[PDB]
Design a protein around this ligand. Sequence first.
Ligand SMILES: C1COCCOCCOCCOCCO1
Ligand SMILES: [Br-]
Ligand SMILES: [Br-]
Ligand SMILES: [Br-]
Ligand SMILES: [Br-]
Ligand code: NA
Lengths: 453, 453
Amino acid sequence: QQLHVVFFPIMAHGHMIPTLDIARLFAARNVRATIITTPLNAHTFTKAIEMGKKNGSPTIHLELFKFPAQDVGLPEGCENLEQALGSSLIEKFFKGVGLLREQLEAYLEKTRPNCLVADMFFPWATDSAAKFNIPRLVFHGTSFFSLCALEVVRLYEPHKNVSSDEELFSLPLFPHDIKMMRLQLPEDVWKHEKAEGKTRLKLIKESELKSYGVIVNSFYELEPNYAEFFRKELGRRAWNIGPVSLCNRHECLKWLNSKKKNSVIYICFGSTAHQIAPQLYEIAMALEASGQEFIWVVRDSWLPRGFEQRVEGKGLIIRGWAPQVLILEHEAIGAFVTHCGWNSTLEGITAGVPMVTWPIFAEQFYNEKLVNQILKIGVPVGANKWSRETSIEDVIKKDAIEKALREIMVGDEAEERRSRAKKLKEMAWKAVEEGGSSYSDLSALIEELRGYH
Amino acid sequence: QLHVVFFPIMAHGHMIPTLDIARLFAARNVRATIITTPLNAHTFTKAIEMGKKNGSPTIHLELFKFPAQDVGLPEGCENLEQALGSSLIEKFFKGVGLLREQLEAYLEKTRPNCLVADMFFPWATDSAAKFNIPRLVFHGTSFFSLCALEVVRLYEPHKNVSSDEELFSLPLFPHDIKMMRLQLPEDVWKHEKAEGKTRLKLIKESELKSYGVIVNSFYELEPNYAEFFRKELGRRAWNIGPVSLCNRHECLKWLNSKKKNSVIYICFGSTAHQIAPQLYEIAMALEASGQEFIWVVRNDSWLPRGFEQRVEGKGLIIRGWAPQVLILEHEAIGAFVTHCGWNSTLEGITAGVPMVTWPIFAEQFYNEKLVNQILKIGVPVGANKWSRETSIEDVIKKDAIEKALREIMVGDEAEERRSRAKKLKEMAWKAVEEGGSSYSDLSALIEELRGYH
Ligand SMILES: C1COCCOCCOCCOCCO1
Ligand SMILES: [Br-]
Ligand SMILES: [Br-]
Ligand SMILES: [Br-]
Ligand SMILES: [Br-]
Ligand code: NA
């Protein structure tokens, strides 16, 4: 019999691409994979499918749902979490995605697949799959570490037993001592309690225990203690099947070919954040002052006066799309500046590149602790304020940036970080090849889905 | 009017407490329906009509056909008490699992606000969910047992021993509690049988998958395990017991002639299966001990000759029904010999009578640890072998029994056990009266069921 798994990601680029990669890993084991998307997001999937769909390359099916943008008052064409800018739109966007339930229940009634893999943001997907005795898996797109850290913070609230914004508290139970401050947690949890965000997080975490289990885009060997903590202490059924990006395995490259090994800083934040002019200026002055050679990807009043001229040949600025994977895997790259989103952290680990960690929002401050204090392949830029809005007060200055750029390239422990990063790269590829922890966990998941009655 | 359906397994120890819970719901103006089978209906009918006429609200019964023939049981075998021997218990569980069709049909028809389903129906969660009905789990046991089973299942302390009698501590517990493999069921520790191990797995997983757990305990009795169950093991729970207390001749006249705390009550229940060689050893122990006793035996090769004559002053035997509650509450009773089933333990705590603990099966060896090592209101008879079958080889001898009867009446700690038992009695009645922990928790549960959306 052929097994059928439906994939239901939230319309955000950082959930969608890893969800596609999971679909491909299932397809490559002779499982029918269907992804549910919306019409204004379909182009993203259909590009990657035709790109990936060469010789071999088993078939990935698409099902399109109508997103009720107008029904909840979203400006028409807002079908993506990236377009929900401001306090106002994010709350309408979630009421938006919650009204996809009717369509999901209809599609599952009709197709009766063997399993639903639904985004963390659809906690109600468990109840929906259950109506047809279909097992539902949760996919978050983050580290075991973050999944554990959020859950012990939610349950033990260690931040209610401090008095000031900067007072450090330990994460309880953890097999490593991890200190955070309130500034690093979202302002709803600690300052002015908003029921909406707090309920939303409650139902997401409760869904990890309510559902059949969790798919995790990590490998056992990367964070063995949190892969265990998540399953034992916090009692989740889980599989680690990542890094899922390794499934299907330029002008700046020619530039890089001319340079010494481990000599270039790559800076790329992604389309996650909006980079404001004053922040870009301070980054520009830091790069010049540091002396380090650099490739800087930006998504002209914000460049210092002589900048383009004075860095000609020690520095490259790219506007828009860079071939990120190829640039990170190049021998010339010695470091990677990032916001510590899990997709970006994984591409650093996989390329074996140490990281300057610039956490902004979501789970990024926990990812920064994994990278800097446990894996020890990174250096903090000094950003410590959780925020989905970008205020002038939170702009990180030249001196802080410059200190991190120097430390990640020519600091005492720079070479050590580089070696630790090279080990994790070798472990990552080994996990996903036959006999690997992540290959095996995927085999065990599929077997268990076959046997489910 | 709010409507709650109660779906207990056909075992006298689940059924009676389930009726008492239904009465507590009725007394707060909730429509209570209990699902039973036709050969079990008489048990509920008796307790209803005896308790009713007193004006107390009506409890409805719904009968399901038990598929005895479909799974190869006798047509007369509608009760876990008739499934005697290795073979029949397995058919009995296949039996009760085929009640799903009828439960789904009845819930579709009647649309109640909540399903309270026995621990043994883990599938009842998905069945209730099909009609967006919350499902509560009811076990009939202590917080201690619920915690102990779950810590033993997850942290497997028994893999690290080498012999059947080697003591291991229960992990994470705030008490040091030492058990041996002999005290655990033979499937979990010796020859791993998928059936009993899968069944236990799905029961424990249902505590987290369902809306929450009703617990027939009071907070004050085991405050540490009431907390551990909710926090460490992350269950939503209400403690509403002892549910026994909601409601509230020849042997009494006999007892009136005796000293305070001078009589041992022995009653295993009419549940219990006592073989003749076991009863003989109990008889010789009672004589040799010199202690006064009332001994209730289930409805004569097992009595020594002239037994009834030689004990005419000191000792009374009752065949069949005894007014158990009235006998245990009488001033003359100084001890209670019982099997450490939670219903029995609760009638000891509630009468304020210390116990000789005779664990046989289910959760009883964990209950025995609570009573002897944490509440310290009991003395073990020295049964340490978990078994659903009663073999002549495992019979507990006169010498062991006689030692426990002496120990519970005139041993070192006898008076202290008596005092500790009297404190727990006072706390038990306080818990279920208005303002009590158990009255409150029931009010909060009902409120939360009203507000369910
Ligand atoms: C099962 C799952 O319980 C989830 C809550 O966990 C909160 C803290 O863990 C403490 C360790 O308990 C062990 C088993 O845990
Ligand atoms: Br680790
Ligand atoms: Br850090
Ligand atoms: Br306790
Ligand atoms: Br004991
Ligand atoms: Na736990």
